[PDB]
Design an enzyme around this catalytic site. Structure first.
Site, PDB file in Angstrom:
ATOM      1  N   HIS A   1       0.759  -1.439   0.037  1.00 29.76           N
ATOM      2  CA  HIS A   1       0.226  -0.042   0.155  1.00 29.76           C
ATOM      3  C   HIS A   1       0.722   1.403  -0.047  1.00 29.76           C
ATOM      4  O   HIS A   1       0.312   2.319   0.092  1.00 29.76           O
ATOM      5  CB  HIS A   1      -1.027  -0.015   1.206  1.00 29.76           C
ATOM      6  CG  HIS A   1      -2.109  -0.779   0.957  1.00 29.76           C
ATOM      7  ND1 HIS A   1      -3.127  -0.929   0.232  1.00 29.76           N
ATOM      8  CD2 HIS A   1      -2.211  -2.025   1.695  1.00 29.76           C
ATOM      9  CE1 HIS A   1      -3.959  -2.054   0.294  1.00 29.76           C
ATOM     10  NE2 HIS A   1      -3.279  -2.725   1.143  1.00 29.76           N
ATOM     11  N   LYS A  56      -6.044  -8.666  -8.349  1.00 31.91           N
ATOM     12  CA  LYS A  56      -7.427  -8.368  -7.472  1.00 31.91           C
ATOM     13  C   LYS A  56      -8.209  -7.032  -7.857  1.00 31.91           C
ATOM     14  O   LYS A  56      -7.643  -6.221  -9.115  1.00 31.91           O
ATOM     15  CB  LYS A  56      -6.834  -7.869  -6.007  1.00 31.91           C
ATOM     16  CG  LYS A  56      -6.092  -6.871  -5.853  1.00 31.91           C
ATOM     17  CD  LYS A  56      -5.130  -6.665  -4.373  1.00 31.91           C
ATOM     18  CE  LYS A  56      -6.157  -7.087  -3.496  1.00 31.91           C
ATOM     19  NZ  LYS A  56      -7.010  -6.067  -3.142  1.00 31.91           N
ATOM     20  N   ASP A  57      -9.397  -6.864  -7.517  1.00 33.97           N
ATOM     21  CA  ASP A  57     -10.191  -5.874  -8.349  1.00 33.97           C
ATOM     22  C   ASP A  57      -9.502  -4.263  -8.216  1.00 33.97           C
ATOM     23  O   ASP A  57      -9.868  -3.451  -9.049  1.00 33.97           O
ATOM     24  CB  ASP A  57     -11.713  -5.906  -7.915  1.00 33.97           C
ATOM     25  CG  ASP A  57     -12.228  -7.341  -8.359  1.00 33.97           C
ATOM     26  OD1 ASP A  57     -11.716  -7.826  -9.214  1.00 33.97           O
ATOM     27  OD2 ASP A  57     -13.049  -7.930  -7.611  1.00 33.97           O
ATOM     28  N   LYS A  58      -9.121  -4.365  -6.896  1.00 33.93           N
ATOM     29  CA  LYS A  58      -8.656  -2.846  -6.696  1.00 33.93           C
ATOM     30  C   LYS A  58      -7.507  -2.676  -5.768  1.00 33.93           C
ATOM     31  O   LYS A  58      -7.510  -3.750  -4.694  1.00 33.93           O
ATOM     32  CB  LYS A  58     -10.035  -2.055  -6.022  1.00 33.93           C
ATOM     33  CG  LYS A  58      -9.505  -0.737  -5.550  1.00 33.93           C
ATOM     34  CD  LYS A  58     -10.934   0.106  -5.016  1.00 33.93           C
ATOM     35  CE  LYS A  58     -10.597   1.548  -5.131  1.00 33.93           C
ATOM     36  NZ  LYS A  58     -11.437   2.285  -4.384  1.00 33.93           N
ATOM     37  N   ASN A  59      -6.612  -2.065  -5.575  1.00 30.06           N
ATOM     38  CA  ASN A  59      -5.689  -1.623  -4.828  1.00 30.06           C
ATOM     39  C   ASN A  59      -5.225  -0.308  -4.679  1.00 30.06           C
ATOM     40  O   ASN A  59      -4.935   0.451  -5.634  1.00 30.06           O
ATOM     41  CB  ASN A  59      -4.126  -2.601  -5.063  1.00 30.06           C
ATOM     42  CG  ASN A  59      -3.408  -2.480  -3.853  1.00 30.06           C
ATOM     43  OD1 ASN A  59      -3.822  -3.264  -2.740  1.00 30.06           O
ATOM     44  ND2 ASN A  59      -2.374  -1.820  -3.672  1.00 30.06           N
ATOM     45  N   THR A  60      -5.442   0.480  -3.293  1.00 27.65           N
ATOM     46  CA  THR A  60      -4.894   1.567  -3.171  1.00 27.65           C
ATOM     47  C   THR A  60      -3.427   1.840  -2.665  1.00 27.65           C
ATOM     48  O   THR A  60      -2.929   1.112  -1.675  1.00 27.65           O
ATOM     49  CB  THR A  60      -5.860   2.349  -1.842  1.00 27.65           C
ATOM     50  OG1 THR A  60      -7.408   2.247  -2.200  1.00 27.65           O
ATOM     51  CG2 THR A  60      -5.540   3.802  -1.671  1.00 27.65           C
ATOM     52  N   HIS A  90      -3.403  -3.016   8.301  1.00 28.96           N
ATOM     53  CA  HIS A  90      -4.356  -3.521   7.437  1.00 28.96           C
ATOM     54  C   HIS A  90      -4.855  -2.301   6.693  1.00 28.96           C
ATOM     55  O   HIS A  90      -5.229  -1.191   7.639  1.00 28.96           O
ATOM     56  CB  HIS A  90      -5.405  -4.368   8.046  1.00 28.96           C
ATOM     57  CG  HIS A  90      -6.728  -4.660   7.357  1.00 28.96           C
ATOM     58  ND1 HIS A  90      -6.489  -5.559   6.296  1.00 28.96           N
ATOM     59  CD2 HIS A  90      -7.861  -4.116   7.289  1.00 28.96           C
ATOM     60  CE1 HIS A  90      -7.699  -5.702   5.459  1.00 28.96           C
ATOM     61  NE2 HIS A  90      -8.499  -4.704   6.138  1.00 28.96           N
TER      62      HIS A  90
END
Length: 103
Positions: free
Chosen positions: A10, A31-35, A97
């Site tokens: 992240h 994965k669909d999204k990661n910030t 997390h």
């Protein structure tokens, strides 16, 4: 799961995250999204200073975020940059997390 993995997943040293390449790796596994948070790691750790027991915390400052968002084609992405607060799980004074982006 822990601060060291949080950093791997992240933190970005550049706003211009290479979405199509970075997301199709074993780390992000399509994965669909990661910030990604644009920052050195150490100042991000500081979001959780003083917070011991597991607790979700929204940042007090906004940060520069880079999202990789999947398109209609699985494992293909668009980069979206934004300025926003975000939430993390703090434990023993470190983010462990990534919870989500603020409203």
């Amino acid at each position: 799961q822990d601060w060291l993995t949080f950093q791997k997943k992240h933190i970005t040293n550049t706003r211009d995250v290479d979405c199509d390449n970075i997301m199709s790796t074993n780390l992000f596994h399509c994965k669909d999204k990661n910030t990604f948070i644009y920052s050195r790691p150490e100042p991000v750790k500081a979001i959780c200073k003083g917070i011991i027991a597991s607790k979700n915390v929204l940042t007090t400052s906004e940060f520069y975020l880079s999202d990789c968002n999947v398109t209609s084609r699985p494992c293909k992405y668009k980069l979206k940059k934004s300025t926003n607060k975000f939430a993390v799980t703090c434990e023993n004074q470190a983010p462990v997390h990534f919870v989500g982006v603020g409203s």
